[PDB]
Design a protein around this ligand. Sequence first.
Ligand SMILES: *O[C@H]1[C@@H](O)[C@H](n2cnc3c(N)ncnc32)O[C@@H]1COP(=O)(O)OP(=O)(O)OP(=O)(O)OC[C@H]1O[C@@H](n2c[n+](C)c3c(=O)[nH]c(N)nc32)[C@H](O)[C@@H]1O
Ligand SMILES: Nc1nc2c(ncn2[C@@H]2O[C@H](COP(=O)(O)CP(=O)(O)OP(=O)(O)O)[C@@H](O)[C@H]2O)c(=O)[nH]1
Ligand SMILES: [Mg+2]
Ligand SMILES: [Mg+2]
Lengths: 100, 726, 333, 27, 729
Amino acid sequence: AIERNLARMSPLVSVTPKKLTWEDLRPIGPHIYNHELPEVPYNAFLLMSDELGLANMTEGKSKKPKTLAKECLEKYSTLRDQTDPILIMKSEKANENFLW
Amino acid sequence: GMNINPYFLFIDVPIQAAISTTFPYTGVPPYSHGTGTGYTIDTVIRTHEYSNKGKQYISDVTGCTMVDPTNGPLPEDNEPSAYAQLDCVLEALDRMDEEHPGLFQAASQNAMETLMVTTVDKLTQGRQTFDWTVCRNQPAATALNTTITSFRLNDLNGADKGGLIPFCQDIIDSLDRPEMTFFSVKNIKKKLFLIKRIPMKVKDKITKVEYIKRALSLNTMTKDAERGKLKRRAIATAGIQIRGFVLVVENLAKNICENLEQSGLPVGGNEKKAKLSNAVAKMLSNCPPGGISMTVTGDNTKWNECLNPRIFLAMTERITRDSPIWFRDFCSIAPVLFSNKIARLGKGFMITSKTKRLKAQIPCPDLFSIPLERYNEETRAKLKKLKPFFNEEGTASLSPGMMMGMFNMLSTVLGVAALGIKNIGNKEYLWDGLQSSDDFALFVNAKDEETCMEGINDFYRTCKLLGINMSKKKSYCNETGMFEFTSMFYRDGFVSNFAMELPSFGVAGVNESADMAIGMTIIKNNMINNGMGPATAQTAIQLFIADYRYTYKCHRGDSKVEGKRMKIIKELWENTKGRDGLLVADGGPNIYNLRNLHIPEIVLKYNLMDPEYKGRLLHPQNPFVGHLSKMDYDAVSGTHSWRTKRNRSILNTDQRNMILEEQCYAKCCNLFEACFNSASYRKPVGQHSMLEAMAHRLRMDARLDYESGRMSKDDFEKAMAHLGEI
Amino acid sequence: QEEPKIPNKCRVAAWVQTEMNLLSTLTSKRALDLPEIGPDVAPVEHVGSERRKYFVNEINYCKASTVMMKYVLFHTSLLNESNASMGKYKVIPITNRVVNEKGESFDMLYGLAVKGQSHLRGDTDVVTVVTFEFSSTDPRVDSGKWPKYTVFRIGSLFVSGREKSVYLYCRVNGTNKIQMKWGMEARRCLLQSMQQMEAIVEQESSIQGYDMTKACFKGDRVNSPKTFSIGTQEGKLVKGSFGKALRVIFTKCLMHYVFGNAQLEGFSAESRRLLLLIQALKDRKGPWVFDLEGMYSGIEECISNNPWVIQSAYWFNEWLGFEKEGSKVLESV
Amino acid sequence: ICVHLEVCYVISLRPQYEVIEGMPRTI
Amino acid sequence: MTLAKIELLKQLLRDNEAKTVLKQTTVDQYNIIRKFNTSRIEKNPSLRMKWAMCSNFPLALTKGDMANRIPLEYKGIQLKTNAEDIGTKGQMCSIAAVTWWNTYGPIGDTEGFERVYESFFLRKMRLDNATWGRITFGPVERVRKRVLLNPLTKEMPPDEASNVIMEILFPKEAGIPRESTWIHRELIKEKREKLKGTMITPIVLAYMLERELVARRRFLPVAGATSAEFIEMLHCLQGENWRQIYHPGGNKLTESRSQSMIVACRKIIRRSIVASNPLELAVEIANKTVIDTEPLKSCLAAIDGGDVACDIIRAALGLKIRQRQRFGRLELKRISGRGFKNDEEILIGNGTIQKIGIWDGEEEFHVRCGECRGILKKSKMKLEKLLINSAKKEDMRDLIILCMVFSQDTRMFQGVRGEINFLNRAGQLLSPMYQLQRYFLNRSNDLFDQWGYEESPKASELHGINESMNASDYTLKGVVVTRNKVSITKNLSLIKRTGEVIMGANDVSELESQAQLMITYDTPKMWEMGTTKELVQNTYQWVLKNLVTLKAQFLLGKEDMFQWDAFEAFESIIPQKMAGQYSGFARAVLKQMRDQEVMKTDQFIKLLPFCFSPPKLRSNGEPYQFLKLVLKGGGENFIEVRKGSPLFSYNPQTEVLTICGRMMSLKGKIEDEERNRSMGNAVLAGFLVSGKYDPDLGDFKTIEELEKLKPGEKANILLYQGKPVKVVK
RNA sequence: AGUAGUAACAAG
RNA sequence: AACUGAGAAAGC
RNA sequence: AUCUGCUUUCUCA
Ligand SMILES: *O[C@H]1[C@@H](O)[C@H](n2cnc3c(N)ncnc32)O[C@@H]1COP(=O)(O)OP(=O)(O)OP(=O)(O)OC[C@H]1O[C@@H](n2c[n+](C)c3c(=O)[nH]c(N)nc32)[C@H](O)[C@@H]1O
Ligand SMILES: Nc1nc2c(ncn2[C@@H]2O[C@H](COP(=O)(O)CP(=O)(O)OP(=O)(O)O)[C@@H](O)[C@H]2O)c(=O)[nH]1
Ligand SMILES: [Mg+2]
Ligand SMILES: [Mg+2]
């Protein structure tokens, strides 16, 4: 039966084998080179390389995250007391007033 | 400005040796959201489009639109085809039988004996089964119990015989009942606004055809945490009526698979690795001199969609040729049930008004109750294509395909039978393969590459004849020596892929001591058989201890971390003199290393614990471990082997009636276990009532106590009076 | 029924290469808090500890480790606050513990987080976290990198006599319980990075008869240090040390976690299917394909807006070009 | 079986003879 | 509490729902209702635990006095929830409650923990009372084998262990008294008396008993140590590239010692036969061989058993030869005889053709089993005679069955009618004779049915017996019942003083099996006793390290570079039949490379190890021709002359040599002209290149055709896929 | 808004 | 509204 | 010569 059906099966039903050559390996996802598309925005949960960690020398006594942050801000009192919003950049749907 | 390109690592280390880097299993696995109706309709449409050229008719049993692609026109292109040829499948099965004389007979004998010695309890081994009485998903035990009670209501007491055969006889007899009366669960909606839904168990009744559809119905949902796929898929669960016979069919197919050298099932893990390595070595040593051997790493596209339950019915009949007619009918039931299977489309679709900020859930029965222009384009097209097969009650006729794919073993048998041909037209090629459920690795030996590709093309066409659609997009071929099979990457030997088992390295989340043991043993096993070196093993120990301490808030006692548990941990650290014996859960140091990964924590620290702390921890009556019942037994485990109740709370739903039924069953089982202490260990058998067994056991115990003098004469009289009134 | 929001199609953004370069670089601070391990007895344990010294000293002093620890600690605190305070807006500082070469311990405050309503009954239910993170980068330098961030200028800091402006990146992000849990378990990015490299060391050992960790990292009197193709500088292949390769793999795993979604999973699977073909080509195995364009489409449908996936496609194209050059070198045989 | 059980019962607070017949195997 | 239980039953029957549940539900259906659960269980326990730990009272308390000892709040930390919701609600506590109990709670008794987890305490004792050797870095070939996870003192089949557990813990509701209840009566009674004074939960005790008795066997990658005491440390024992020497504590059964000794002796002999003066090398290795923690000489002296290899090593070491054999429960001593093993396509009773090991020639064995003895005389596949002594019925039956199987009687093979598996589910070769023994021990009826019965002996002392183990009037054919110094040759041949060889190296079983214990070789050349892949990798690494000197000697020297210790060890994995042909072919190829200017360094490395054995050229004086040199062990252990091989591949682009999966670099030892150099001159012995693929010559000629060519005759050779060339003599 | 991605959450 | 089969691990 | 009880987690299919 198998040979009979293969004989009467359409020749168009083929696995279409093709010897692979390096020329056949075109670059993947050409559209990512399309300058008409926007650059992929930074969408990570936190800043990875742009992170700025205010450093506070400790005394081997971890009290609480709240007190740790309070002490770290107190050391950098210039940043903590800044109440003047110098808006540099704004997300289109954000509210700089509410965010500040 | 040098730019780091991680792929340049492959310039040095081959892909297989660095395959672990290609598995992003440190990230969150994709999770499906909302309804799964879209994917269910997609699979229904795909199945019917792959089977549309077949014979379409209407079932006179259910009235559903049935499609039969088997024996249909041979495909004229490479699209997924379900038009399997019965003659080709039977020829493949005959070839396999010739290759394995007596294999079918032995498999049928084993399956029949197992069925004869199989009990109805075997149907409780399922996660979530479609309970037809409530038309929902219930734990397999719950669905089985509800089905048994409903059958009792309908004078179907085969389950009481204790065997699977009488219960399946009841299953097939219930289809003949003019109407089925069962225990359903409804809910009263009280507005307090909040619509609290208080469920209660009542009695309902349905007709013959409705019950038939429910029994043939498969409930669909969305799979969660699936990895390696961009788009989400749908999964389906069957009822008791189907699983009952699927068990026997799968057992027969498993018996067949265990004796096939080209099957990757049911073997697994190291056994599977050994089998595959031996097969690859044999196929390398069998290469004709000067010839070319080529391995095709191949995946089959739309495996469940194109597999036809009628083909599996034919396979069942062919395999069970020498069996008694009762067993042949029993094995044929399951493919018959799957050929008339109905798919429940799920939770429906959510329609929203953005400006009015409103949303509503249109259920599957009401899917076509609104104009199709109110659905999005994709959903609109899906509904338009689904309409012919849509059932007014809110289900779809899915006669073709194997949506659930519960025939993994039988599909493996079909694939192996496809591999068994090995040649067509006496051409100058010979193929032999390895066949898991759908994934496969072919090995074609010929005189040159051209003949190897001819053989691969012939294998492709032959699989098309059997209803198997090799995926040209995902399948590729190279010279023998490198390939991939079931994500096992063979490069002159199966390389170690450390990333696959990476997700299991974390806290297993059972309890402190159990999780400690699980993590240590996982590290040990990964070291044994996943290529994890001693340095990575020690780092894994460190990371597991870190995650464990941050999960159970049991940081080192001398540490400065603060918490509700940490204050008492620090007090214990100060009180304890043998601090090295304190458990990690109690803020003690981590003394685990590679050599002692196989020793439990308490045993490791038993000789270092202080007597006081050791006694407090290993208190036989500590309240944190569930006891059995003073008369309560001694719980040997420590205080850290505690249990957090698996609270299945549902907002605005007070399942007091369901909890009451569950607690009634629990009380009956607890009393029975108290009467029969061996019930927990060894399953108690018997066709008689639990009350009868308990009464006889208590009467014998009372008589023995009276004779031995344990019980006073007046107490014996009281016991006898109570038993008499019982 | 509203149309689903399809992920946008974005082009290669140069900031992903910068992130890969900076996260692989060696900093001066340690963030890993690896707990103690029982004393070594067997020679296998001593070998493991010796190898761990090199591996961790390479990973531990890298920016990627600090970022991973920040993510882990923040997700732990966020899960704790979400379960402890379901109906309250909580301030969750973004904190980390760092240690420099001198053994000095510092508390690093990278910003604050507002944990909104967190009645997270479902596993995929979303809690909104409003992150106000300190930074020194000026957004205007790469505006396309920061369309999601509202950035203010709040002051300045003196790492030295130099003056560095400080900006407050404000973003209304969100996360679910599954993401929090997997953030608490991001430490696994170490193992996948170590094992892959550790195996290599083991391989070298089997070829030399003795532990080759020091030789692979630093190079002993008999073996020169292991050098890997690490990257490109002006279109020329560049060689990095063994520790640099370890840090690159660790950064790759950390980005797998950070930018891990269905897009990355699908891209990984399909591009692995393609990587196996490329390897078969490099091994002169004469690979044959049946539908190459179908496999390419399967790969490409997973490249929409995941920055890591887009940069992975770019790196794959670059590495494929280099492998094509290598094959051209191979042809004359 | 019926005759055997009847004979056993005819043969039979504290009965002299306990009955092992006329009950399920397990009991 | 029988009265209390009866009162509870009456109280439960006072509830109509419980009454109907008890009445309708059968005893079998109990197992269903025990699993009744209305609400589906959640499926992310790790996330659920991380979520619950960040809460007030995730833990559940057990109502009682011990739960009351826990204070409501401790130093402002609420350990347990308030008790104002007692009504049908339950109680909860925090993890801080657990810590408080561990800190200030009552001090209980630990005897229960010691009793229940005695298995893990024994595991810890084995770990602690153990010594560690040295870690060796080098190739390790691990074979996936089904090994026992943990040591046991009495291993029983799972059903037998379950019956024993039921008898020990549940004597009353144990069911039918089975064979296990009798054959394990002593153990059951001992455990019952030991467990008499215990209040631990019966299910926990049952799991303790099954851990003590039931055997957990798993497929694991092992390398030369499969004993459970070693399997439990497998994670530290070795990897794919390193091997840690480990000496577990506790007592070791002598069966494992004997098996490891046999494996060690077989390895020593296999490595020694190829050596010049095999006796000296065999003695040298055996004097430095340690079985687990004892020297090989002591093990041979103290073990009253072994095989041909053990006897040969004993003779080499001076110990007496113990010509004893073990065939399962049967122990035999070769009184006299001689036979050479062969592989025969034996036809089994159920129509199965198997390459079973068959012995030939007259052979007499003093056999014994249990407490019974006898004398078995046999010939090729026939039991000539079996004179057995009077003993117990079961022991006598076991002896007769085992002797029937050992004799390989044709009736015994034809007596197999049933399910007999000679191949494990992983495709590994099970021993056919042992499988036949296992089948016939249980299903022994058919063996006696087909064996045939003749007249019982009427001699003065000889009286026959039948299947009833009684002196019946008819006896089993060929079976009767009765009531009544060596020297070793250089080539490891055991010879009597008369001049007759009694055992030789060629008589050693070729099977390569993992040792039960860890065999150590305290010699610098301890890798020469490794598996095929390990030997190949070590030899090629030695070649690479000395590649400069080897090549310089080859260019300068003529024949002194083909003799080395590493190549001598490598020869031990080349079959003797093909060793000479491989040596001739490889030497011819290397000489043809040297004489001409074609020097493919990769081919020189590939073929150099094979140039050790004395050449065995064809009858016409020309070397054989090969496409692949097949090495001993496994189907993938071969070297491709032209193509790459699983054991040896070369990448000219990167000049990287992948041997057994390990990548070495030839960068530094290479000439840039070599890449342009043609591979056709380093493929066929006595063949050079002349041009490209010539259509006129014809199609590619095979090895048989190539060997028959005349001098100066051109032909087409396909070096590998896509690379045809034209070669001449 | 945002997270996220073929459908959801942004409490019931 | 977390299915099927296989493998390993842990707990009862 | 090792082959001849279920629940949950992870991986694979
Ligand atoms: O573990 C393997 C082997 O090492 C072990 N074995 C063999 N001998 C002993 C002793 N003496 N003590 C402890 N363990 C022993 O049993 C396994 C056997 O594997 P293998 O090495 O493959 O066995 P072999 O190849 O020799 O064939 P096998 O039939 O198993 O016989 C082994 C043993 O028995 C002798 N023997 C069997 N038969 C049927 C024999 C026969 O008909 N005539 C003679 N002269 N000897 C026979 C074998 O020769 C060996 O002595
Ligand atoms: N019952 C289940 N079967 C599964 C599951 N995952 C895989 N499988 C089986 O394995 C087969 C492979 O399915 P995949 O997940 O690989 C679907 P993929 O999109 O990769 O293949 P096609 O779309 O069919 O080309 C599938 O047909 C099933 O028979 C699962 O979660 N449940
Ligand atoms: Mg797939
Ligand atoms: Mg595949």
